[PDB]
Design a protein around this ligand. Structure first.
Ligand SMILES: CCCCCCCCCCCCCCCCCC(=O)OC[C@H](COP(=O)([O-])OCC(O)COP(=O)([O-])OC[C@@H](COC(=O)CCCCCCCCCCCCCCCCC)OC(=O)CCCCCCCCCCCCCCCCC)OC(=O)CCCCCCCCCCCCCCCCC
Ligand SMILES: CCCCCCCCCCCCCCCCCC(=O)OC[C@H](COP(=O)(O)OCCN)OC(=O)CCCCCCCCCCCCCCCCC
Ligand SMILES: CCCCCCCCCCCCCCCCCC(=O)OC[C@H](COP(=O)(O)OCCN)OC(=O)CCCCCCCCCCCCCCCCC
Ligand SMILES: CCCCCCCCCCCCCCCCCC(=O)OC[C@H](COP(=O)(O)OCCN)OC(=O)CCCCCCCCCCCCCCCCC
Ligand SMILES: CCCCCCCCCCCCCCCCCC(=O)OC[C@H](COP(=O)(O)OCCN)OC(=O)CCCCCCCCCCCCCCCCC
Ligand SMILES: CCCCCCCCCCCC(=O)OC[C@H](COP(=O)(O)OCC[N+](C)(C)C)OC(=O)CCCCCCCCCCC
Ligand SMILES: CCCCCCCCCCCCO[C@H]1O[C@H](CO)[C@@H](O[C@H]2O[C@@H](CO)[C@H](O)[C@H](O)[C@@H]2O)[C@H](O)[C@H]1O
Ligand SMILES: CCCCCCCCCCCCO[C@H]1O[C@H](CO)[C@@H](O[C@H]2O[C@@H](CO)[C@H](O)[C@H](O)[C@@H]2O)[C@H](O)[C@H]1O
Ligand SMILES: CCCCCCCCCCCCO[C@H]1O[C@H](CO)[C@@H](O[C@H]2O[C@@H](CO)[C@H](O)[C@H](O)[C@@H]2O)[C@H](O)[C@H]1O
Lengths: 69, 198, 179, 91, 486, 469
């Protein structure tokens, strides 16, 4: 009569919630490992304002015919 | 054991009361290793400071409330009492026993009681009964082993498949359950192996 | 596999070890303390040329030979090559137990080096990062780094072998009364 | 007494990410193997009784029970859930 | 009310007790018995009809690092007990107060540090049985080595420096390969938890690699031949509490580690590798027993004796048989009872009286020390596996399992029954036998304290030997959870 | 703030006496604390790993570099506290530890060079900053000019750093000769797999790495660390390493190099073995730093190494500061002052410290077992994350070497603890002089961090996943 253990159903449910939290942390770790080592933009990786990688060089003797696409 | 049995003055006197005595290690020996070398007034003196070791000079509500300067006094002049007591107890093989009416205590022989160790009340009244409780709990949790459950379940499955056993007499159903168990297969393990059936 | 040319690789081995021994002898001659000259590079070198050449010849010869005898390319060949190189390095100390210990221990060490891939570097297309990982999706063959909830039983029986509990059919279904 | 009778779950019908059903299936497998063992022990007890009652007639009277016990002993025993949990016999 | 109020009450009481009486051993023994009682209450409130993990709690979560988690994303350390955990937890809480009381009167310099280290090691071992992931298990499996180093170095015998360095370095050597294994598991599965790790089936060629590291750790911790040489030195040159704790619990952590880390995961690698385990175990049995037959130090003899019984336990746990698992667990428990009693006799009774452990000095204790002789005979015949002691039950069932798995090796391993008797009774016969030694003066017989400890440890093993079945209500799932048979 | 500090302190020190340098150090320590408190909200710029290019395209600012800068400020705070606060107000400790007039200015200029190394995006900035670090740290080694050993170390360090700077400049100008550029942003997949470029890049890496003691070029820096003052050694053994390794980790230059693997294995073996027969404390700690530099070399071969490097460098910095502070605290109990500059040299002078100060030995034990990598301490999680990365990237032999080095180094780490917990005759019973409050608090805080920082690992990972991924 002194034995008052938590029932089997509630034990199973609590363990299941724990395992669900653990699998959620697993999937979050995988997602974060995948969002890292994913190619980012030039604005996010180098320069958010001057977002043009194309260099405009000197200006003192700028020859027409020097630009090229 | 008492609640509030601390009294500053006797400790603050007892400090140099004990400092006037020789060291505990060298008192009862005299450097000649003989109880006889110590004088007999000195011996009674040592006896009545040593009997003060096993006296309630502090309570719970005095250790929880008073300050450090008094507790340190108690501690460092209780260590001396302890060491005097036990060095006499070993060298002389006598404990001090103040008898009832005469107010004079001296080392005596009687060691068939009136002495208890400090670990006994902890163990014999917190540890031993807890292990007895563990034995009780183990014995009565053994009733919940799966063997008994499986026996009851198998009998119940047989009774569900063959309800005709119940109207038979009450001291004959066991043999009939045994007969039907021996005949049939009331387990449901191949029931659970669904993908093994090709 | 494709066989190794033992004598050619071992001749290259010997020339490389000889050059390395010359370089080490020159370095020792220039770093040393006492009076020294261009004479002492080979007089006072502590067998550096013979160390390098012997180790090189022994390692490459034993490696290619074991690869051609065993008819395989694996780390045991590096175990044998390390055994031989250690035997050479231990014959210098003119004692038997030191020779045996050198042989056995450098064999074990180089065999570990070969077991792990025979490289201080990484493969970098067999690593876990660059390889398909995680749970495999639909009945596909489980690769090395992939994970599976439930494996095939034919695969288990082949990898492990029948007996000692592991059988081609479960016991309960195999002993089920045909009813 | 409130004797419990839990529901039987199989590994073949569940999704292994629902851990409750996986534990139900483990416990189901183990419980049914214990029921198999109790059947084996019933057979053994009957064999013992027939031996103790018959004596020299046990060779004839207890024959089927003895053969049944030795047929059941290798197979009606505890053999664990992992072997079926981690292996699909259909492949 | 508050949590902090209650533990601050306990902390203030501890501080005042230390201020007034300058010692901690009474408070630590009170906490010892209180923890034992709390664990018994948890056993009262434990459901035997669920294989699940109970009394779960999570620590060091992102949302509540200094508290318990209720999150839907679990990133901290997981804790919780199964029946297997609870068995060894009962053993641990039974033994801790006895290890404190075994050194009650023989530590007269920096006592409080000794008792702190002892209780700390015990609580680390308890929490290690409470663990439910590879990383919490590891950080509680390796956290004892600093404490053991300090304890053995400061409070140890003549050769204590060597023993301190051994108990750290050997164990760290094995445990770092265990760490490589755990790291591989975590990067491959992205999860570390003992609840659903039998659902993840790795490839065989990777199981066979993870198993190597875990088994090197188990070989250094069990111990097993050829890496068993640290155990005599450490168990010999340590203080009594250290030897008791070590032989009783830290050696059993390896058995628990097999059952909890290596069998549920890595089932196919185990079922391929176990003949190598049987090689190593049979060697560990016979050669260690024979090596015991030529030792001159008593505590060293008992130390060597632990290794053979742990090898029999390894035969049992690596048998793929329910009876073998149950036998290995009963061996662990009964050895954890009996071996600290022998260590008490040879390191706290005799060593406290004579401060020497060489067998040539000891002879004829029966004349002046008869109660001690009775205890020696009882504990010897219990250690060698006499029936009606749990040692026999465990040995019997472990060898049953070993015979079922490999009849030849499991049958050859039954000379354990003989060699145990040889190396134990060759010592008992000399100690109890003959005329009392001329190198030893007379001293007191065993005290009430020593007798209390030995009597607890004898009652326990006799209970579990006369009715081993009382341990089944916490193990009838565990004896089938780690069996790989199709 | 650093340049403001430099331009302020130059004037204020020129117009001040030598009696005021300690208070000047206190002032600038509080300045750095206020900066690290009030200006540290700039972490919000780097949300979702937003990266910024500043001063044209000469500097780069991301979460990595912001973190390394906060770390360098924390280190400078501790090192300045050791100079601005007297341990004991005795004549001895006013003879041993006195700041020189220009020392704080040189420290701040070296910190400037450190940060302009980690923030560099173009090789001209890198070279200017490398030289601003190395000249200042020559002069820091030389400022205690009344020491023969320190002058000698100054000159050795000048010449060896000069040669390695020649190597760096050759690498840079060869890169320019090939690609006509000074920027590593100019590289991509195509340029790497189209041009063979590994000689130049590994020449740069080695010119930077041999400046922090990478084998076989370790003996000179170990001699410099031995022969310098203790309170100079504590700085010159740590901050250059942080700077250069952080640059080499941010710049993905040696992703699968065989040479760097070989030299890292060599660093591990040397840093573990050579420290076994060392009888002196600073050489032992130098070989410890060498093997930790090897552990951090290993993650120059990964391409995803931010978390491991930041964790390990933070914990190594805390442990390094703590152990040097414990050796500085132990001078009150050693029985023989060796020099005015290195008052404690040999490890056996720590014999019996547990009987004079037991909790100092508890601190030593915590730090020693963090160096060994014992859980639940911080070095264990460091080693764990490094192992995770290198095994995820396929370095399986290096891992076993790492374990073996972790084991061999424990012996000389435990030498200290072993001799410290030994017994000694002539113990301390009373002393009316008390050690400083501030330095005691700093050491206790470092020890508590080592001991209880594992509680926050979940939180740190969750923050990393937002600011670095
Ligand atoms: C993981 C899971 C682990 C599971 C663990 C299992 C649970 C563990 C349980 C531990 C129990 C501990 C109890 C305890 O703490 O007691 C402390 C306490 C410690 O002993 P102590 O006497 O105080 O020691 C100090 C000396 O006495 C002081 O010195 P001394 O002067 O007194 O010297 C005397 C000493 C010295 O003599 C010697 O040297 C001889 C060596 C001692 C050997 C003792 C071993 C026991 C022998 C039993 C013999 C039976 C054979 C059959 O000899 C003895 O004390 C032995 C007395 C022999 C019995 C007397 C005859 C009365 C009848 O023991 C007791 O008070 C009595 C405990 C007895 C309980 C036994 C259980 C019997 C159960 C009844 C059977 C039928 C029903 C069973 C079903 C139950 C359903 C509920
Ligand atoms: C001429 C014709 C050429 C033909 C073309 C082919 C030639 C191939 C040449 C290969 C290179 C050979 C170089 C030989 C090494 C340099 C000589 C040397 O002695 O190195 C050690 C040097 C001096 O040592 P010493 O003064 O003699 O005293 C020794 C007492 N202990 O002192 C030093 O510190 C210098 C060290 C230089 C080391 C370079 C890096 C070596 C990397 C070590 C590999 C470790 C990897 C193994 C990992 C296993 C892990 C268990
Ligand atoms: C894991 C981290 C490793 C920690 C291992 C413990 C190392 C402790 C070594 C130093 C020590 O003795 O701890 C200090 C102890 C007090 O030492 P104590 O014997 O009481 O001497 C008088 C104190 N004023 O104070 C203590 O009680 C601390 C106990 C830990
Ligand atoms: C430290 C001393 C802790 C003693 C244990 C206290 C305790 O267990 O109280 C449990 C209390 C009541 O729980 P209970 O009776 O079991 O009923 C559950 C129904 N809700 O419920 C509670 O108080 C909440 C649960 C308490 C969890 C205790 C966690 C102790 C962990 C100590 C961390 C040690 C740090 C060292 C590093 C560890 C690294 C692994
Ligand atoms: C600073 C002081 C001032 C003096 C400076 C002196 C001039 C500087 C010389 C160059 C710069 C020094 C470089 C330092 C040595 C380390 C270079 C290095 O490690 O780069 C090697 C690198 C490949 O290594 P890695 O990228 O790590 O691995 C992947 C392999 N696919 O890249 C490579 O693959 C290298 C390409 C291989 C060719 C090497 C050329 C050597 C040719 C010598 C032949 C001599 C003739 C034979 C012997 C004559 C002796 C008599
Ligand atoms: C930063 C001062 C460093 C000085 C040394 C003191 C350590 C401070 C750690 C805080 C780091 C953080 O909270 O940040 C997490 C960082 C990135 O986050 P962040 O971009 O820098 O934003 C932080 C914004 N602050 C500045 C306002 C806080 O991830 C990491 O890899 C940190 C790895 C370090 C692990 C060491 C843990 C030490 C235990 C800490 C116990 C309180
Ligand atoms: C000091 C104690 C030392 C004892 C510890 C021993 C642990 C050493 C690690 C052993 C496991 C290494 O694992 C090993 O497995 C696979 C085979 O399964 C090898 O197999 C691989 O080898 C390499 C080299 O040719 C190629 O990728 C090849 O195609 C194959 O895939 C790997 O080269 C190695 O990674
Ligand atoms: C002490 C224990 C810890 C040791 C430390 C190292 C742990 C990691 C073990 C090494 C992993 C080696 O793994 C490596 O070899 C296996 C083969 O076995 C290869 O696996 C690949 O093998 C090829 C055959 O060559 C097959 O197509 C197979 O399907 C798979 O794709 C991978 O290229 C790589 O995964
Ligand atoms: C360092 C000394 C070593 C000590 C080792 C012994 C530790 C023993 C701890 C065992 C007690 C764990 O008991 C545990 O029970 C439940 C799990 O269902 C936890 O979780 C409980 O949290 C509370 C939240 O308010 C709610 O009741 C919730 O429904 C849940 O039941 C408790 O927070 C914890 O108390």
């Amino acid at each position: 009569t002194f034995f008052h253990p938590k029932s089997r159903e509630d034990i199973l449910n609590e363990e299941a919630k724990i395992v669900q939290a653990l699998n959620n942390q697993r999937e979050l770790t995988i997602k974060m490992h995948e969002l890292k080592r994913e190619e980012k933009d030039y604005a996010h990786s180098y320069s958010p304002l001057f977002s043009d990688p194309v260099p405009q060089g000197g200006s003192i003797g700028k020859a027409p015919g020097s630009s090229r696409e | 054991f008492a609640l509030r049995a601390y009294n500053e003055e006797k400790e603050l006197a007892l400090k140099q009361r004990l400092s006037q005595l020789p060291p505990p290690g060298k008192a009862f020996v005299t450097a000649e290793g003989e109880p006889r070398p110590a004088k007999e007034a000195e011996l009674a003196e040592l006896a009545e400071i040593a009997a003060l070791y096993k006296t309630d000079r502090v309570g719970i509500l005095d250790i929880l409330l008073l300050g450090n300067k008094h507790a340190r006094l108690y501690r460092d002049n209780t260590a001396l009492l302890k060491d005097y007591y036990y060095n006499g107890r070993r060298i002389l093989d006598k404990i001090p026993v103040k008898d009832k009416q005469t107010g004079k205590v001296t080392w005596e022989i009687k060691r068939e009681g009136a002495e208890k160790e400090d670990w006994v009340n902890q163990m014999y009244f917190l540890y031993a009964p807890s292990l007895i409780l563990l034995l009780i709990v183990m014995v009565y949790k053994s009733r919940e082993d799966i063997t008994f459950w499986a026996k009851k379940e198998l009998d119940q499955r047989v009774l569900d498949k063959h309800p005709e056993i119940n109207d038979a007499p009450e001291n004959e159903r066991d043999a009939l359950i045994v007969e039907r168990i021996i005949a049939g297969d009331y387990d449901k393990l191949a029931s659970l192996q669904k993908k093994a059936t090709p | 596999f494709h066989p190794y040319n033992t004598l050619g690789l071992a001749t290259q081995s010997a020339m490389v070890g000889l050059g390395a021994g010359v370089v080490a002898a020159a370095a020792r001659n220039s770093l040393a303390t006492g009076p020294r000259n261009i004479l002492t590079t080979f007089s006072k070198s502590g067998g550096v040329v013979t160390i390098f050449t012997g180790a090189s010849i022994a390692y490459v010869f034993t490696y290619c030979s074991a690869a051609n005898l065993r008819e395989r390319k694996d780390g045991w060949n590096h175990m044998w090559a390390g055994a031989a190189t250690g035997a050479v390095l231990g014959a210098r100390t003119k004692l038997v137990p030191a020779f045996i210990g050198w042989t056995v221990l450098c064999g074990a060490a180089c065999g570990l080096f070969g077991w792990t891939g025979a490289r201080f570097n990484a493969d970098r297309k067999a690593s876990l990062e660059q390889s398909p990982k995680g749970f495999v999706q639909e009945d596909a063959h489980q690769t090395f780094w992939e994970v599976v909830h439930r494996r095939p039983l034919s695969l288990t029986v082949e990898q492990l072998g029948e007996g000692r509990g592991i059988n081609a059919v479960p016991i309960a279904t195999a002993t089920e009364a045909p009813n | 007494s409130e004797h419990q009778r839990p529901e039987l779950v199989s590994f073949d019908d569940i999704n292994y990410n629902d851990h409750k059903k996986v534990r139900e299936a483990q416990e189901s497998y183990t419980r049914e193997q214990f029921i198999r063992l109790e059947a084996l022990k019933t057979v053994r007890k009957a064999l013992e009784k027939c031996y103790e009652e018959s004596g020299p007639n046990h060779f004839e009277d207890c024959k089927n029970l003895a053969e049944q016990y030795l047929d059941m002993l290798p197979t009606h025993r505890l053999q664990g859930y992992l072997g079926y949990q981690r292996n699909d016999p259909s492949k | 009310m508050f949590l902090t109020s209650i533990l601050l009450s306990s902390l203030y009481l501890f501080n005042r007790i230390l201020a007034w009486q300058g010692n901690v051993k009474h408070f630590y023994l009170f906490a010892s018995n209180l923890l034992l009682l709390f664990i018994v209450v948890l056993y009262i409130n434990f459901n035997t009809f669920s294989n699940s993990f109970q009394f779960n709690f999570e620590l060091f979560n992102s949302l509540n690092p200094f508290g318990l988690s209720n999150s839907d994303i679990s990133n901290g350390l997981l804790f919780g007990i199964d029946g297997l955990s609870l068995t060894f937890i009962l053993l641990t809480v039974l033994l801790i107060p006895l290890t404190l009381l075994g050194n009650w009167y023989n530590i007269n310099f920096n006592s409080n540090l000794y008792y702190t280290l002892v209780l700390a090691i015990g609580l680390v071992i308890l929490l290690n049985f409470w663990a439910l992931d590879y990383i919490s298990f590891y950080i509680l499996f390796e956290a004892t080595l600093p404490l053991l180093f300090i304890l053995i170095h400061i409070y140890g015998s003549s050769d204590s420096e060597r023993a301190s360095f051994y108990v750290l370095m050997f164990t760290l050597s094995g445990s770092l390969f265990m760490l490589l294994s755990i790291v591989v598991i975590s990067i491959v599965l992205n999860t570390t938890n003992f609840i659903n790790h039998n659902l993840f089936v790795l490839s065989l060629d990777l199981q066979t690699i993870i198993w190597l590291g875990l088994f090197i750790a188990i070989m250094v911790k069990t111990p097993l031949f050829p890496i068993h040489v640290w155990l005599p030195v450490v168990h010999s040159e340590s203080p009594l509490a250290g030897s008791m704790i070590l032989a009783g619990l830290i050696l059993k952590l390896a058995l628990y580690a097999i059952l909890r880390l290596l069998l549920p995961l890595l089932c196919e690698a185990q079922i391929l590798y176990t003949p190598m385990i049987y090689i190593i175990s049979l060697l560990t049995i016979i050669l260690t027993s024979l090596a015991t037959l030529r030792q001159i130090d008593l505590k060293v003899i008992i130390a060597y004796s632990s290794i053979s019984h742990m090898g029999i336990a390894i035969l049992g746990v690596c048998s793929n048989t329910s009876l073998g698992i149950y036998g290995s667990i009963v061996l662990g428990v009964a050895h954890g009872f009996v071996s600290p009693a022998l260590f008490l006799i040879v390191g706290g009774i005799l060593y406290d009286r004579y401060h020497i452990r060489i067998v040539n000095y000891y002879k004829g204790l029966t004349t002046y020390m008869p109660q001690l002789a009775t205890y020696i005979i009882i504990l010897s015949f219990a250690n060698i596996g006499t029936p009606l002691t749990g040692n026999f039950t465990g040995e019997f069932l472990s060898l049953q399992g070993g015979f079922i798995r490999n009849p030849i090796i499991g049958g050859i391993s039954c000379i354990s029954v003989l060699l145990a008797a040889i190396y134990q009774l060759k010592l008992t016969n000399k100690l109890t036998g003959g005329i009392s030694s001329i190198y030893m003066h007379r001293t007191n017989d065993v005290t009430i304290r020593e007798k209390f400890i030995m009597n607890i440890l004898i009652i326990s093993t006799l209970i579990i030997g006369i009715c081993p079945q009382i341990m089944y209500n916490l193990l009838y799932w565990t004896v089938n959870n780690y069996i790989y048979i199709i | 703030m650093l340049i403001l500090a430099i331009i302020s302190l130059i004037t204020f020190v020129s117009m001040s006496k030598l009696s005021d340098n300690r208070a000047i150090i206190r002032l600038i320590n509080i300045y750095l604390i206020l900066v690290l408190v009030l200006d540290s909200f700039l972490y919000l710029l780097f949300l979702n790993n937003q990266t910024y290019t500043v001063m044209g395209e000469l500097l780069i600012f991301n979460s990595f570099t912001f973190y390394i800068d906060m770390l360098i400020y924390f280190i400078m705070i501790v090192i300045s506290s050791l100079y601005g606060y007297n341990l004991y107000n005795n004549n001895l400790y006013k003879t041993l530890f006195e700041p020189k007039k220009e020392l704080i200015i040189l420290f701040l200029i070296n910190i400037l060079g450190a940060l302009l190394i980690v923030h560099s995006n173009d090789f001209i900035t890198l070279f200017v900053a490398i030289e601003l670090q190395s000249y200042s740290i020559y002069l820091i080694t030389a400022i205690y000019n009344s020491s023969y050993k320190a002058s000698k170390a100054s000159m050795l360090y000048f010449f060896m750093g000069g040669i390695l700077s020649i190597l760096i400049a050759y690498s840079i100008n060869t890169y320019y000769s090939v690609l006509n550029s000074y920027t590593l942003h100019s590289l991509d997949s195509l340029i790497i797999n189209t041009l063979d470029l590994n000689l130049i890049l590994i020449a740069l890496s080695l010119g930077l790495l041999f400046k922090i003691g990478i084998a076989p070029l370790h003996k000179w820096l170990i001699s410099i660390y031995e022969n310098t003052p203790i309170l100079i050694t504590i700085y010159i053994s740590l901050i250059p390493k942080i700077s250069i390794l952080s640059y080499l980790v941010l710049s993905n230059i040696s992703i699968n190099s065989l040479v760097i693997s070989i030299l890292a294995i060599l660093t591990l073996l040397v840093g573990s073995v050579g420290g076994l027969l060392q009888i002196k404390i600073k050489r032992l700690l130098a070989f410890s730093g060498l093997t930790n530099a090897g552990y951090m070399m290993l993650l120059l071969l990964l391409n995803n190494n931010e978390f491991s490097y930041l964790y390990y460098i933070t914990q190594y910095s805390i442990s390094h500061l703590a152990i040097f502070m414990i050796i500085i605290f132990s001078i009150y109990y050693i029985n023989y002052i060796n020099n005015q500059y290195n008052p404690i040299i040999y490890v056996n002078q720590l014999k019996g410290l547990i009987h004079d100060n037991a909790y100092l030995v508890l601190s030593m034990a915590i730090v020693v077992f963090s160096f060994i990598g014992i859980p639940p301490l911080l070095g264990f999680f460091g080693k764990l994350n490094i192992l995770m990365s290198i095994l995820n990237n396929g370095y399986y032999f290096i891992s076993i070497v790492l374990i073996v080095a972790s084991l061999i180094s424990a012996l000389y780490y435990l030498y200290l603890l072993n001799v410290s917990i030994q017994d000694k005759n002539n113990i301390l019973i009373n002393s009316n002089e008390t050690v400083s409050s501030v330095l005691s608090y700093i050491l206790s805080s470092l020890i508590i961090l080592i001991t209880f920082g594992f509680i926050y690992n979940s939180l740190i990972i969750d923050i990393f996943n937002v600011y670095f991924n």
